[PDB]
Paper text:
Excitingly, we noticed an increase in stabilization by increasing the ring size to cyclopentyl groups (117 and 118). Compound 117 (cyclopentyl, ether) showed improved stabilization with both peptides (FA EC50 = 15 ± 2 μM for ERα, 32 ± 8 μM for C-RAF), whereas 118 (cyclopentyl, aniline) showed greater than 30-fold selectivity for ERα (FA EC50 = 5 ± 0.4 μM, EC50 ≥ 150 μM for C-RAF). Crystal structures of these analogues in the presence of the C-RAF peptide showed a similar conformational switch, indeed indicating a steric clash of the aniline conformation (118 EC50 for C-RAF ≥ 150 μM) with C-RAF, resulting in a peptide displacement. This explains why the ether analogue 117 was preferred for stabilizing C-RAF (EC50 32 ± 8 μM) because its conformation close to 14-3-3 allowed for the peptide to wrap around the compound. Additionally, the larger cyclopentyl groups of both analogues (117 and 118) participated in hydrophobic interactions with Leu218 and Ile219 of 14-3-3, both in the presence of the ERα or C-RAF peptide, explaining their overall increase in stabilization. In contrast, for C-RAF, this conformation led to steric hindrance, and small groups in position X in combination with ether linkers were preferred to position the compound close to 14-3-3, allowing for C-RAF to wrap around the compound.
In this work, we focus on the hub protein 14-3-3, a highly abundant adaptor and scaffolding protein that binds to hundreds of phosphorylated and mostly intrinsically disordered protein domains. 14-3-3 is a dimeric hub protein that binds to its clients via their phospho-serine or phospho-threonine sites and upon binding creates order in these disordered client regions. 14-3-3 binds at the extreme C-terminus of ERα via recognition of its penultimate threonine phosphorylation (Thr594), thereby suppressing the transcriptional activity of ERα and concomitant breast cancer cell proliferation. In this work, we report the structure-guided chemical optimization of this nonselective disulfide hit fragment 1 toward small-molecule covalent stabilizers that preferentially bind the 14-3-3σ/ERα complex over 14-3-3σ/C-RAF.
Author numbering:
A (entry chain P), B (entry chain P): 255 to 263
C (entry chain A), D (entry chain A): -4 to 231
Amino acid sequence: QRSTSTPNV
Amino acid sequence: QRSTSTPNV
Amino acid sequence: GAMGSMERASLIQKAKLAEQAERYEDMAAFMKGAVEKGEELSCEERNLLSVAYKNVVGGQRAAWRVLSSIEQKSNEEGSEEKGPEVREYREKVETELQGVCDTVLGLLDSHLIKEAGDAESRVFYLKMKGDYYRYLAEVATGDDKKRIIDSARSAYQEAMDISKKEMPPTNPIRLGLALNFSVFHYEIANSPEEAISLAKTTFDEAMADLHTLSEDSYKDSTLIMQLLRDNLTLWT
Amino acid sequence: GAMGSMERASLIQKAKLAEQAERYEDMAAFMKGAVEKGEELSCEERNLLSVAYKNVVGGQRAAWRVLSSIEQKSNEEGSEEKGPEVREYREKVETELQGVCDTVLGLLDSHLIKEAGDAESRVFYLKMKGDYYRYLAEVATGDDKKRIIDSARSAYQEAMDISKKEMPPTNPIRLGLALNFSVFHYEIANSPEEAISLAKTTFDEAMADLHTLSEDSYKDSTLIMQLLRDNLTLWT
Ligand SMILES: *CC(=O)NCC1CCN(C(=O)C2(Oc3ccc(Cl)cc3)CCCC2)CC1
Ligand SMILES: *CC(=O)NCC1CCN(C(=O)C2(Oc3ccc(Cl)cc3)CCCC2)CC1
Ligand SMILES: [Cl-]
Ligand SMILES: [Cl-]
Ligand SMILES: [Mg+2]
Ligand SMILES: [Mg+2]
Ligand SMILES: [Mg+2]
Ligand SMILES: [Mg+2]
């Protein structure tokens, strides 16, 4: 599993 | 709700 | 044009990769290239062509419905004037959708249908022809609409005639064709009773032939039969 | 180029319609047109630009990962030779991804960042710059990779310095920047301890400032804080 980045506005 | 047609192969 | 330098086998290989990557615009371009090599398509190849263009046009149909709904809302009494932008953008998407439909219809006419002698291939292509005229009909208005509707009906009807003569009632192409023609009757042609009658007769005839099928064939046929049932439930 | 004849206000209106229709390629083209009018962007407008390009590049990143995995599998001992097609198609998608990243970086350099004087706008754009260098880094190899990684680090660092001086610890832009810089450290820079330390310190400082927030601001801040926590759980 890849790390989570900021989601879409 | 729209009628259902044949799904993708 | 742009795929003229690529091997037919390479185009098919890349269509399969594009499917895995959910890159349906690429997949469709690869399959167009493959068709334009001029050789008839295998069953697997016909499936790739169908999957690619169905995904592309499916996206367009969904977008068009969103925009048409916004547009209809704006043209109601009491709604504030916002200028030409909604109509302009709905028209842009519409034109792109029509372009995709014309491309597919072009491939079928040059020369997939005429070179298709076997029932399984000819019915598959005539069903496709009906479907892409049906997608054109969804966005058409006026007298243009009438001729487009007639073209869809004519394609579906030829496919139906062949499938009834040449295929068993459980054949999935025959079932999918009947499903889609029923959708045409209900959603496009303002003939809900014809739609219901077709779905019912198709379902019952398939039911009677299920005993002849192996487990894999049984699973495919029954899936499509359930879709007929889903529509009958929606329509009644 | 192609949007030169359309009003700025019309381009923004159409970007919003394209968002509703999930037409992110169109949305991005409309927002590029808007930026190229030469006026600074409002907060809402910055949001539209970000949403459009994030969706486009997101699709490309997903496709690239699928294809890279197939390619890696084919280059293992005991795998059968299938010719150049997998590499060719991965390269096609990769080139398109790099093109989108270069387009965004171009908009930021001409002239969004230099004209952005307020902390909220400048941090937003520098974070974007870091993100699109990070997406380039994901597909880069060799010495080219080193310079791309350095460019991402430099952009994120300038953004961090400003955000620490000018914004409270709960500000969602500051939180999102720290989240993304932590992802950079873990996934790109081979610095998992730096990633963990950043996530932890960011989380704790925000926690201490939550009492100052209204209900709407609280909801946004805590959402992003939970993402920091999700990563810390993944990483430890
Ligand atoms: C103009 C402006 O202030 N935009 C940023 C604002 C931040 C909060 N928003 C969000 O959608 C969420 O967080 C971020 C945080 C940073 C960035 Cl760059 C984007 C989104 C999404 C997760 C919770 C709030 C709205 C836009
Ligand atoms: C070359 C070939 O025989 N293709 C048709 C075949 C039919 C069954 N398949 C399907 O994916 C399902 O049904 C249809 C039926 C007709 C059409 Cl035109 C497409 C799909 C999908 C629902 C259950 C089986 C595989 C392709
Ligand atoms: Cl338009
Ligand atoms: Cl290619
Ligand atoms: Mg009013
Ligand atoms: Mg029109
Ligand atoms: Mg072998
Ligand atoms: Mg490359």
